[PDB]
Amino acid sequence: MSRVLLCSAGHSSMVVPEAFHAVPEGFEEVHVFTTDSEKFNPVVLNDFFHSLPNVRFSITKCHGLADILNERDFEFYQEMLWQWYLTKMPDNELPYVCLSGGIKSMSASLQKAATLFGAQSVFHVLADNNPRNIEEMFDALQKGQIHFIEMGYEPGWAALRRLKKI
Amino acid sequence: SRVLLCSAGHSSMVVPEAFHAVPEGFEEVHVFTTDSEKFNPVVLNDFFHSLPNVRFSITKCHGLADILNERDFEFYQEMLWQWYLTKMPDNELPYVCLSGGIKSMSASLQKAATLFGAQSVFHVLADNNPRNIEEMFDALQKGQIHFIEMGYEPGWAALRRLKKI
């Protein structure tokens, strides 16, 4: 059984190296849903998981969306997010979800998917001085200056999880 | 009565934007903020005094300046859900704006709605980050502020009776 980590990442890609450490045992899968904004930095994350090859790592770009700016873009975003969530979800398990990255309209639609499709532990990650690279986040992990905010198990809907068959 | 409930933090201007993103206006407004120093109540009040046909009530979380660890969020959350059940109408469901505050302020106000009900969980989005009143009324006027509703949350009457303990 696979402890899977689902995330939304924005410009600040450092949030994913911080959500993988916030669960002590570790993780198996790590999937990241981001926009096709050129401000997304794939490099900070492809250096980090290339030192953990026991972690099946993935990044989905929503081709053709960059900045959610009006009502149609969010209707286009929410739907694309909600699809990605059912697929990357494990088949025998609820996933671990991180609400930290992106903009606020990215993160509240992700709260709804976890409540609608289930989530082992919806959680939020806070930091004291905002680490910008891997050393900063490693030495700030070392002095106890990253706290993990848990929000609680989400039972979801077994019926609504069958939607990935259609 | 249509009620508007808003988390607020550093950028105060989300609340007068949330006021105008519902065409008819609001009779009540209630803000739930920490006792931060950065929270500027002055721009809000200056707007909400020019509109004397409304009832405005900020409620400062007395003691909390910032949420930093899992203990400070659980103080925040429990004080938020009382206030959400305090300021909720008796017969109608409130309008909830997830625009101000931090992300754990908004995801908990998010939950609050789903547990108790919310006529409309919405989230106001702008373009240039309006710094003041004249800028916002010019933003509203050039068609740059966006009302992103997210959905009616019917809530649970079996949990709304909980205000009576």
B31: phi then psi, degrees, rounded to nearest 5: -115, 140
Domains (range + CATH), chain B? 3-164 (3.40.50.10770)
Residue of chain B nearest A70, judged by CA positions: B146
Q: Which of A105, A124, A147 sits opposite B68 (nearest CB)?
A: A147
DSSP letter at B154?
-
Residue of chain B whose alpha carbon sits nearest to that of A74: B148
B95-97: strand order across its sheet? B55-61, B28-34, B3-7, B95-97, B118-125, B146-153
Instruction: Tokens for A47, please give them.
Output: 């250096």
Residue B117 tokens read as 């009900």
CB within 8 Å: B104 and A126: yes
CA-CA distance, A129 to A119, in Å (whole number)? 29
Alpha-carbon Rg of chain B, whole angstroms?
15
Q: How many contacts does A have with B, using Cβ atoms within 8 A? A: 59
**A165 known member of a binding site:** yes
- The single residue listed with the structure tokens 């009324």 is B137
CB contact under 8 A, B107 and A124: yes
Q: Are strands B28-34 and B146-153 parallel, antiparallel or unpaired?
A: unpaired
Q: Identify the residue whose tokens are 């990357």.
A: A88
**Cα–Cα distance for residue pair A70/A56, rounded to 1 Å:** 34
Per the CB < 8 Å rule, is B99 touching A104? yes
SS3 assignment for chain A: CCCEEEEEECCCCCHHHHHHHCCCCCCCEEEEEEECCCCCCCHHHHCCHHHCCCCEEEEEEECCCCCCCCHHHHHHHHHHHHHHHHHHCCCCCCCEEECCCCCHHHHHHHHHHHHHHCEEEEEEEEECCCCCCHHHHHHHHHCCCEEEEEEEEECCCHHHHHHHHC
Least Cα distance to B67 among B99, B35, B41, B97 occurs for B35
Asked if B43 and B68 touch (Cβ cutoff 8 Å), the reply is no
Residues A79 and B38: their CA atoms lie apart, in Å, by: 36
